[PDB]
Amino acid sequence: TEVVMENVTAFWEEGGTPVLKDINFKIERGQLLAVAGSTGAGKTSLLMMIMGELEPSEGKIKHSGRISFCSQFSWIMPGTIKENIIFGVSYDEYRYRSVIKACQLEEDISKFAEKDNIVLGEGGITLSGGQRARISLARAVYKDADLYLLDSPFGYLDVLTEKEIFESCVCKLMANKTRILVTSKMEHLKKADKILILHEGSSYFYGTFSELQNL
């Protein structure tokens, strides 16, 4: 198994209310876990636990290897669009091109005279919310890792663009990779190997889309 949580309870503040309560799941290598739930349910906190920023007060956690994290808040640093996506990782033309195509950034980049050398984050170009989200997603996906933590990465995208990139990037380009995707969208839960729905820290549902349909 690649990631396990067993009876996990955790607190951000000593003596506060638990942010996660008796959470259970397992992800095998190469699978996709969808993590859903309302605002404040604990989804980002669950990712933080996997990244070692929050320790369990009860329960056990298993995860090994290197992590790539995509924040739900998209961000850009001063530099070219290519530099923002590679972000200090060694460069490979084929890998880079595959990521930007899977994130629909080829269209955006082709429109600039400077192409992949267009400069971001320095007062020239002002990116849309959807461009910044796809660049942030591409940055996380370009990075080689054992586990990809994609926290609501489709911000500002219309539902068809979100669907297309979920399929081209999360399902096809990343098909061999262990993935945790924070998302509420029905198709994403249906395509996931497992679903975890959080509500106020607790496991509202854990299982498969098919199991939920049978209920």
Ligand X SMILES: Cc1cn([C@@H]2O[C@H](COP(=O)(O)OP(=O)(O)OP(=O)(O)O)[C@@H](O)[C@H]2O)c(=O)[nH]c1=O
In the complex, which residues of this chain contact Mg ion (CB under 5 A)? 44, 72
31 is in an annotated binding site: no
Q: How many residues bind to ligand X according to rule CB under 6 A?
A: 12
Give dist(CA 174, CA 70) in Å, integer: 14
75 is in an annotated binding site: no
Give dist(CA 72, CA 44) in Å, integer: 8
Give dist(CA 63, CA 22) in Å, integer: 18
Residue 203 touching ligand X (CB under 6 A): no
Question: Would you say 49 or 86 has its CB closer to Mg ion?
Answer: 49
Give dist(CA 92, CA 160) in Å, integer: 29
Q: CA angle, corner 168, sides to 166 and 171, nearest 5?
A: 65
Residue 18 touching ligand X (CB under 6 A): no
- Stretches 25-33, 35-43, 57-65, 135-143: which one binds ligand X (CB under 6 A)? 35-43
Question: Would you say 116 or 188 has its CB closer to ligand X?
Answer: 188
| Backbone angles phi and psi of 83, in degrees to 5 | -65, -35
Residue 41 touching ligand X (CB under 6 A): yes
Instruction: Note the residues at the interface with ligand X (CB under 6 A).
Output: 12, 19, 37, 39-45, 48, 72
Which residues does the annotation place in the binding site for ATP?
12, 37-44, 72
